[PDB]
């Protein structure tokens, strides 16, 4: 009673042909389905029992059985087939779902654009202090943060966020609060947010005085 | 959709391997319906659909229906010796002149009736010896739109 | 004939307290179908709660699950229920109905949020995040909106009454360790437009009917 999917993650171009696998628990054909979902939305079913294409599902999308692995394929991927993909497996007596492809668009390396925003006066008096450090428009998602407060290097007490791959660019946007208490905040001088990414030749460090 | 079914009691369950399947249908409301039982087996390499029995029921009295559809065992000769002692499937489906409206599977667990050959299973497989047990409360349900008259 | 399931009975629940959920389902009669409700946590992959089977009403669970949720169907009413008991923090999550196709499910529902916590029903503050030299470089400059503490989920942030979308990133939600939630929105804008167009965030956080329009100008 078990469904393990693969792989989590696929970077892809429009064109590709994509394969997806899961090796279920029980090799009846019958049993398993693949779903497409998109952020905020409900699931689309897109093959049921191992092989049958689901009404109004394009011919691109085909399934298939070996043993114990069933496979989803893509044969030419489309810009509306960018998505998580689960399969499915509706045993004797528990339904359970795989954990999901999340198939994601390649594109070149492009360099964050880098700002940084002081808490506003307002915020201070209500006795607390973000700092925010916006990573923008940048690819690939992976991009590491470093907050430095007077040089002193922190830790956590930050909280990163990352927006979905933008449906225009193909890029990501990342945003860095760095909490303190007023008086915290206002103990200290520089506060500076250093950004290591593999676009920059160098890590990028955005800063400001007061505090 | 004409033709609705309103119910399917599988009535010898558990039973022998050879026994004949017996289902009590009910369905509600010119061309003969055609109830069919199909087996389905699914090996390493193998989906296989092995059809059962079919019997076409015409006239079709109109209104609530009720009667009994006995469907002749699978052949064990025509199923791998892997599928006799495993979990398999049962598509239970009525078509209206040749496009089936109505499918629904059943989930099958097939296992000897004695301890010692459950715990010692022959080289050779023992038909005589195998239960089927139908999961018969859980059934899987398809429904096709087709046209009638 | 249109097929629809709608869900409805979602919201926030403290720890070991009741909810029902119900799916309105129209252009099928509910009990000639199996019935399931799948739930997603935030942000995590499909979990399978309950199904209900068409004929007898038979009725299978997830263990997680087993004892303490009851689905069941009323055929006059063509709806669908889960009747959720002793309810835990960990079934938080969006809770969809859907429609059996053989061993698959063809039919969904938008789905319903069940938030269960303690916690109390809290509108957020909202900071700007003003445009300066420090946000600002090579004619474009950013600018946003932070959205603090505020409990449960969701909040919803426009820019100029839904006007402005390009350059729009309003960041997921981040669960803080206070257990409130916080995102920002930001946006990207021409520099030199900064003396003349006014920029505003429109933050509505409906579980505490709490509408913030917050003007984000630079600081002199």
Not at chain 1, 77 to 91: H, K, M, N, W
Not at chain 1, 100 to 108: A, D, L, S
Not at chain 1, 113 to 127: M, N, R
Not at chain 2, 77 to 99: K, N
Request: proline residues 6%.
């Amino acid at each position: 009673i078990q469904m393990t999917q693969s792989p989590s993650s696929l970077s892809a171009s429009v064109g590709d042909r994509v394969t997806i696998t899961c090796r279920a628990s029980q090799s009846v054909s019958s049993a398993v389905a693949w779903y497409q979902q998109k952020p905020g939305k409900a699931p689309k079913l897109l093959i049921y029992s191992a092989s049958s294409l689901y009404s109004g599902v394009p011919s691109r999308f085909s399934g298939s059985r070996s043993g114990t692995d069933f496979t989803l394929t893509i044969s030419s991927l489309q810009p509306e087939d960018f998505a998580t993909y689960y399969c499915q497996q509706d045993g004797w007596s528990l339904i359970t779902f795989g954990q999901g492809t999340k198939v994601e668009i390649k594109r070149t390396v492009a360099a964050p654009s880098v700002f940084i925003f002081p808490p506003s006066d307002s915020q201070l008096k209500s006795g607390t202090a973000s700092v925010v450090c916006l990573l923008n428009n940048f690819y690939p998602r992976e991009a590491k943060v470093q907050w430095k407060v007077d040089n002193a290097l922190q830790s956590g007490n930050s909280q990163e966020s990352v927006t979905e791959q933008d449906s225009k660019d193909s890029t990501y946007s990342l945003s860095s609060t760095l909490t303190l208490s007023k008086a915290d905040y206002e103990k200290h001088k520089v506060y500076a947010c250093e950004v290591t990414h593999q676009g920059l030749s160098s890590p990028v460090t955005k800063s400001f005085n007061r505090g | 959709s004409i033709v609705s079914l309103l119910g399917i009691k599988v009535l010898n369950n558990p039973a022998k391997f050879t026994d004949p399947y017996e289902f009590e249908i009910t369905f509600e409301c010119k061309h003969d319906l055609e109830w069919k039982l199909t087996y389905v087996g699914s090996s390493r390499s193998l989906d296989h659909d092995q059809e059962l029995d079919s019997i076409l029921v015409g006239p079709v009295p109109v209104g609530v229906n009720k009667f009994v559809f006995s469907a002749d065992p699978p052949s064990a000769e025509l199923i791998p010796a892997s599928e006799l002692v495993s979990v398999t499937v049962i598509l239970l489906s009525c078509s209206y002149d040749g496009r089936e409206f109505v499918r629904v599977g059943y989930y099958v667990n097939n296992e000897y009736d004695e301890e010692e050959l459950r715990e010692n299973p022959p080289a050779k497989v023992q038909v005589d010896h195998i239960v089927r047990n139908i999961l018969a409360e859980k059934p899987r349900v398809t429904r096709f739109n087709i046209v009638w008259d | 004939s249109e097929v629809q399931l709608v869900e409805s009975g979602g919201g926030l629940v403290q720890p070991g307290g009741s909810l029902r959920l119900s799916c309105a389902a129209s252009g099928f009669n509910v009990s000639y179908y199996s019935i399931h409700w799948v739930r997603q946590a935030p942000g995590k992959g499909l979990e399978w709660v309950a199904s209900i089977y068409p004929y007898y009403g038979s009725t299978s669970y997830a263990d997680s699950v087993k004892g303490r949720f009851t689905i069941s169907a009323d055929t006059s009413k063509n709806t669908a229920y889960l009747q959720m008991n002793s309810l835990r923090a960990e079934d938080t999550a969006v809770y969809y109905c859907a429609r059996g196709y053989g061993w698959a499910l063809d039919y969904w529902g938008q789905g319903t949020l069940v938030t269960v916590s303690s916690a109390s029903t809290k509108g957020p503050s909202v900071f700007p995040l003003a445009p300066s030299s420090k946000s600002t470089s090579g004619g474009t400059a950013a600018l946003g909106c932070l959205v603090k503490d505020y409990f449960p989920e969701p909040v919803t942030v426009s820019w100029n009454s839904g006007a402005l979308t390009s350059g729009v990133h309003t960041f997921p939600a981040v669960l803080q360790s206070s257990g409130l939630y916080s995102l920002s929105s930001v946006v990207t804008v021409p520099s030199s437009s900064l003396g003349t167009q006014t920029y505003i965030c429109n933050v509505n956080h409906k579980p505490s009917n709490t509408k913030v329009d917050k003007k984000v100008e630079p600081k002199s």
